[PDB]
Symmetry: C4
């Protein structure tokens, strides 16, 4: 619970939980006829994966579960450069294992088609859920990634009352999904996008680069804003 | 509030609340025409029964309310073997009393049919809400049971900030229902499955064995992972 | 914030907030075409009125906002008999003022009809939303009132971690509404039922006696169970 | 994080987040065919913007994000007159930048029409979502603004347990939206109304004066009630 391999295991398990729960709710439950959970149910699910695992393993690894979080916290002066790559690998691996099991579960229902349905992948333009342009996709992911990082930096500030951060951060995740699912299906998380794109297997992989660079640039901006403008004291 | 019969009463009352509230929301409110609460409303209800009773009686018994939780915590080194069976009996009894009163309440509406409607029971294949295969049912219940146990172990770790665990655990329950209702109607709780199966009275009882072994195996895996991989320090 | 007239003002304001917010969400928003909030949105609203005011004025009066809570806490040995009646009056008055303003607001939309729509009143049988029998109404209100009191006693126990009770109690209120709206429109609160019945002006007033005796009997049972079975230590 | 320009930056960022998230969820997600989030999803989004930023930057500026909050806290004796105007400017500026980026994002979907759709603006009468009269609009905004201020004063009282206020206040915001969206689309926040009215560009601007005076009068009333009736001790 403090040697690096335990932190990496925590990060893998937490990103697994995020992908399995968030994407799983989208694939299995969102569009279920009459009773299905909708975009709002998916948004809640994503936020709860983050809230629950932040409480469960946050005291072990920091509970990032998201390459743009790790890199943003590096930019914000909160996390060492030398640990970044190990965390990103752990997150990507955890997420892919989750998408794999989800793919197996989803395949047990007649008619399931990962490629055709999109398998909860992030896309823009032709592949945005609401047909939003690439420019709309860029602006929304940049803003929401920066804000998510600003919220993470603030809620874990020296002077923020202790213990509440998993609630602030997890519900910031729900919020972000409530806003942006129609635009990009909501990434703000390169590991989540990657895990699911692998099984969609087509356009998701062709557009994947976008859901690495934009959330990471946004997260860096959020970390820099907090570090340079809000933190001092 | 610390002699065993008070702990057993707490466990019975808490499992009663889980079954009455979670299953009750499903039976009475989920499909109500136009205004009904849907799968997302049921998921919220299940999580709130756990959150509320964990705050109410967690300081008395540990607030398990779930045979797979009790057994998983035993596997994780958090709970003594000698207390396991008493807790499981208390949970099963509490749950059956709840399903009985729910059955009475539900029967007060013209047309109600427990057997035909399924009475919120857990099933797979032919009896999965979305027609998922037995293999889909196995994987989802194994993963979500293990994760639920991992979340419970982590949120109650020595180094997790105090007081927040009922929130982490209750909302993990909501999450689990948001994901898996279409697959199995969501068990991860052998006492919940049993209580309701008794009144459905048919296929629910024929498939009940599955919702004992799979959540318990999953909970044991989650406890072992936390104990052997994440806990040390 | 501790002399009795401040406590009574807190109780009046808090019950006003409960009635205005819970009933208001039901009257104004629940059935709004396409976008309306449904039973689940109303349940959330009721729970949030309780959560928010418990945090706002709980440190002043105890934050009961509900005659069955006050009386149940008396039964549970937590609240003095000599203060009960003043609290009940304050709650009833606060609630009626709220229903009055809500009635005014609702009347500003063409077609509004308090009597015909039911104005969010509690009823059974012919006047149950789902056509549930009087016996169904009795059992559900008895169980949910007792459980609500058990949750309140437990979450505010000596050994419950401090500060979290408004969350446990407010979300127990949401849960209770998620379960029972189809049966009785959910009372568990005699002051809420009274305030709204006055403006429905017909069957609501004829059935009002029921939503005084049943929640109060239930609350007393919950308080007695906690006091006599769960509290000692 | 305590010199005034950091507090003003916090207030600008927080009001940006409120407008971008709350209005954004309304513009992009509320009416999305089949899966859209509805009024309840928007209400949740508004409350989460406030909850998340209150945790993130509340320890910096007080986390007002709302001209009626700033002015109400002045009225309640909690905030100095000399800092009011700077906060109000910061909130208005933050909000307008957010509406501008939202306008850009929304414009990336074929058919988008800010003026015709209303762009999430607040209105009454002809421009109330449910066709409520100006009098209905007045009463609901007055009551909900006063209550929101009462909740803010209480949750941050000397004797309220520490750390929980962002939860009480953010969820009070969700509640307020659950109630009143059909009446006015919910203001209780002059900066939110202004930011969005600018881009609707028509009736929203003609009715804007109303969503300055009414929330501010209401907030002042709430602050005065708490200060003069509830606070002493
Ligand atoms: C640590 C893991 C980093 C994974 C980054 C994956 C980015 C892949 O991104 C890109 O690669 C393909 C091959 O060139 C291109 O054809 C696609 O357009 C694709 O988006
Ligand atoms: C971190 C691991 C992610 C690897 C991303 C590389 C994606 C490869 O990229 C390609 O693969 C598809 C399948 O052959 C092709 O159809 C697409 O054109 C795509 O660009
Ligand atoms: C402590 C309570 C444990 C209850 C375990 C119940 C498991 C019952 O399980 C099984 O038993 C029946 C009779 O053999 C079989 O016909 C069914 O297939 C059924 O699933
Ligand atoms: C913990 C108590 C649970 C007891 C589970 C035993 C279920 C009995 O099992 C049987 O009972 C049904 C009714 O007769 C039969 O129709 C089914 O075939 C079922 O297997
Ligand atoms: C402190 C406030 C207590 C209010 C209790 C109100 C109970 C009214 O209850 C009853 O009174 C009417 C007149 O007899 C009867 O006709 C109705 O059936 C009604 O339900
Ligand atoms: C706490 C104050 C609540 C007073 C409850 C008394 C209700 C009076 O009761 C009566 O009033 C109606 C209107 O005239 C009649 O139509 C009904 O028959 C009803 O029983
Ligand atoms: C600090 C920012 C305060 C902004 C207050 C904006 C109030 C504008 O309000 C009014 O002004 C217009 C011009 O007279 C009128 O035509 C409109 O009816 C409008 O509502
Ligand atoms: C804080 C900045 C807000 C400025 C509010 C002033 C609104 C101007 O007000 C006017 O502008 C519209 C556009 O020309 C006109 O069509 C309307 O009649 C409106 O009253
Ligand atoms: Hg994340
Ligand atoms: Hg996230
Ligand atoms: Hg996120
Ligand atoms: Hg995410
Ligand atoms: Hg459980
Ligand atoms: Hg559970
Ligand atoms: Hg569970
Ligand atoms: Hg459960
Ligand atoms: Hg209540
Ligand atoms: Hg209540
Ligand atoms: Hg209640
Ligand atoms: Hg209530
Ligand atoms: Hg606000
Ligand atoms: Hg607000
Ligand atoms: Hg508000
Ligand atoms: Hg607001």
């Amino acid at each position: 619970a403090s040697h690096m391999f335990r932190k990496l295991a925590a990060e893998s398990f937490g990103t697994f939980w995020l992908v399995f729960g968030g994407s799983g709710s989208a694939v299995l439950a969102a569009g279920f006829p009459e009773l299905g959970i909708g975009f709002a149910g998916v948004a809640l699910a994503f936020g709860l994966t983050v809230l629950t695992m932040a409480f469960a393993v946050g005291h072990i690894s920091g509970g990032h579960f998201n390459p743009a979080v790790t890199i943003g916290l590096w930019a914000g002066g909160r996390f060492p450069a030398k640990e970044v790559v190990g965390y990103v690998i752990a997150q990507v691996v955890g997420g892919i294992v989750a998408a794999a099991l989800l793919y197996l579960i989803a395949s047990g229902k007649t008619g399931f088609d990962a490629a055709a349905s999109g398998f909860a992948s992030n896309g823009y333009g032709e592949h945005s859920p609401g047909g939003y342009s690439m420019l709309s996709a860029l602006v929304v992911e940049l803003v929401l990634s920066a804000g998510f990082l600003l919220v993470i930096h603030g809620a874990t500030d020296k002077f923020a009352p202790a213990g509440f951060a998993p609630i602030a951060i997890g519900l910031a995740c729900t919020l972000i999904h409530l806003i942006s699912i129609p635009v990009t299906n909501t990434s703000v998380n390169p590991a989540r996008s990657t895990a699911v794109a692998i099984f969609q297997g087509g356009w998701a992989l062709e557009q994947l680069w976008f859901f690495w660079v934009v959330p990471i640039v946004g997260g860096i901006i959020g970390g820099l804003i907090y570090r340079t403008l809000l933190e001092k004291r």
